[PDB]
C-alpha cells in the first residue's frame, strides 16, 4: 500500500500550499512574487505531467493555479492575464 499520490492530489496539495500562503501576503509582491510563482508552478506541473499517461493528463485542470489565485488569493483575472503574457514572453516556454 505505498500511497500512489494522484496527479489530482499533487495539484490539490500544491494549490493549497500556494493559496494559503498567498492569502496572508498578497499584495506583498516581495514575499508573494506572482510572476515567479506562476512561471515555476506551471513549469513544475508541466515537468511532472510530461512523463504521465494520457489518463493522468485528465486529472489536471487547465485552470489549476489560475482559479485558486482568483477564488482564494484575490488576484484579478485581468492582472493574471498579463502575468501569464509576461510568463510566456519572458520565460523558457
Amino acid at each position: 500500500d505505498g500511497l500512489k499520490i494522484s496527479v489530482g492530489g499533487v495539484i490539490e496539495s500544491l494549490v493549497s500550499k500556494i493559496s494559503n500562503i498567498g492569502y496572508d501576503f498578497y499584495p506583498n509582491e516581495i514575499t508573494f512574487p506572482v510572476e515567479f510563482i506562476i512561471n515555476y508552478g506551471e513549469r513544475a506541473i508541466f515537468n511532472f505531467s510530461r512523463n504521465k499517461s494520457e489518463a493522468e493528463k485528465k486529472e489536471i485542470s487547465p485552470n489549476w493555479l489560475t482559479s485558486s489565485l482568483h477564488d482564494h488569493v484575490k488576484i484579478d483575472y485581468w492582472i493574471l492575464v498579463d502575468y501569464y503574457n509576461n510568463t510566456i514572453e519572458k520565460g523558457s516556454w
Binding site: Y23, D24, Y26, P27, N28, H70, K74
Partner: peptide, 17 residues
Amino acid sequence: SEIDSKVQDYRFLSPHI
C-alpha cells in the same frame, strides 16, 4: 493582522454585500 487581506477580500465580494 488580517486588515491587509480583508481590504482585498472586499474587492472580490459580490456587489450585493
